[PDB]
Amino acid sequence: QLPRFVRVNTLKTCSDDVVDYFKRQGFSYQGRASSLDDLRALKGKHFLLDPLMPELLVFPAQTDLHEHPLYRAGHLILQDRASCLPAMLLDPPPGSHVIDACAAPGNKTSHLAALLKNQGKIFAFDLDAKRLASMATLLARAGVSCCELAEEDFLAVSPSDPRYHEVHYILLDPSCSGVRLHALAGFQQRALCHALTFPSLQRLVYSTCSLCQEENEDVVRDALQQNPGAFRLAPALPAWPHRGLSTFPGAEHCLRASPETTLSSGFFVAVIERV
Numbered sequence: 001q002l003p004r005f006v007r008v009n010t011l012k013t014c015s016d017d018v019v020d021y022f023k024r025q026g027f028s029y030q031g032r033a034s035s036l037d038d039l040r041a042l043k044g045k046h047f048l049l050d051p052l053m054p055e056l057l058v059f060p061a062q063t064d065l066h067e068h069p070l071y072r073a074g075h076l077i078l079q080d081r082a083s084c085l086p087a088m089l090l091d092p093p094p095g096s097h098v099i100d101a102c103a104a105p106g107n108k109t110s111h112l113a114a115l116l117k118n119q120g121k122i123f124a125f126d127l128d129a130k131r132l133a134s135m136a137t138l139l140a141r142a143g144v145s146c147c148e149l150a151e152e153d154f155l156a157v158s159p160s161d162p163r164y165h166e167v168h169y170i171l172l173d174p175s176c177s178g179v180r181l182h183a184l185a186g187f188q189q190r191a192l193c194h195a196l197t198f199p200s201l202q203r204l205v206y207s208t209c210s211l212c213q214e215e216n217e218d219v220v221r222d223a224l225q226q227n228p229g230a231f232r233l234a235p236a237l238p239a240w241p242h243r244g245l246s247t248f249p250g251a252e253h254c255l256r257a258s259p260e261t262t263l264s265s266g267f268f269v270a271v272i273e274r275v
């Protein structure tokens with residue numbers, strides 16, 4: 001199956017320290033991968049850094065770290081390779097205000113917090129109590145202190161609420177396919193259009209783990225047609241070769257992902273910026 005991807009949580013440690021710990025357990029550090037073939041070749045107790053994703057270590061498919069001392073300590077966060085894209089691309093600076101619109105169980109929220117260096121605010125929302133409970137555990141384990149978490153419908157969050165007036169960055173990572181399809185795409189469109197109405201918004205990242213154009217390029221296309229000229233697609237990570245389907249002008253600025261092409265979950269990401 002796929003290699004195991006583990007994000008070094010910079011809130012609590014650094015890559016040098018994690019590497020040294022694993023070395024002392026008899027793992028052999030291979031540096032940074034030159035290519036995906038390097039990751040595909042991973043075996044035994046070799047490990048390396050992802051060829052593109054900062055702070056992302058990669059281990060052979062048959063290694064479990066859920067019980068590792070560094071997992072307990074919140075030094076490692078087990079996060080699919082493509083799941084690391086949205087916060088990295090959003091790139092909010094320390095001190096900024098961010099909304100994580102569909103946040104639980106908090107993997108991307110924890111990544112945002114690391115990028116913020118726990119400075120600023122992440123207003124996170126979700127409706128699922130069980131996933132919210134998992135999120136509380138993850139956030140605390142990872143040492144996140146900048147998140148205000150609410151059990152709320154994102155569509156009920158008012159863009160004119162004074163609490164969100166300095167929000168410049170939004171991460172929108174809504175539920176997606178699995179043939180529940182038209183309803184899912186409906187929520188995705190509603191949520192994206194809603195997010196784009198936030199008064200001070202500068203950059204938004206939209207992501208799914210779907211392969212379906214209806215949930216991906218079509219949603220972005222339709223949202224951009226809401227207020228033509230207000231927002232544009234930004235040209236995301238050129239070194240990532242799997243792009244959005246060429247279904248509208250600029251769509252190739254989005255990213256796609258799959259086990260076979262990118263050693264990750266099926267995934268889609270669009271970087272949307274204010275004009």
Ligand SMILES: C[S@@+](CC[C@H](N)C(=O)[O-])C[C@H]1O[C@@H](n2cnc3c(N)ncnc32)[C@H](O)[C@@H]1O
Nearest residue numbers: 102103105106107108126128153154173174175
């Ligand atoms: C793909 S998961 C998000 C994963 C999360 N971003 C992470 O990185 O771990 C989608 C989430 O959307 C939540 N959700 C569904 N409808 C919502 C709504 N109306 N408002 C806020 N969250 C919602 C679901 O409960 C689910 O937790």
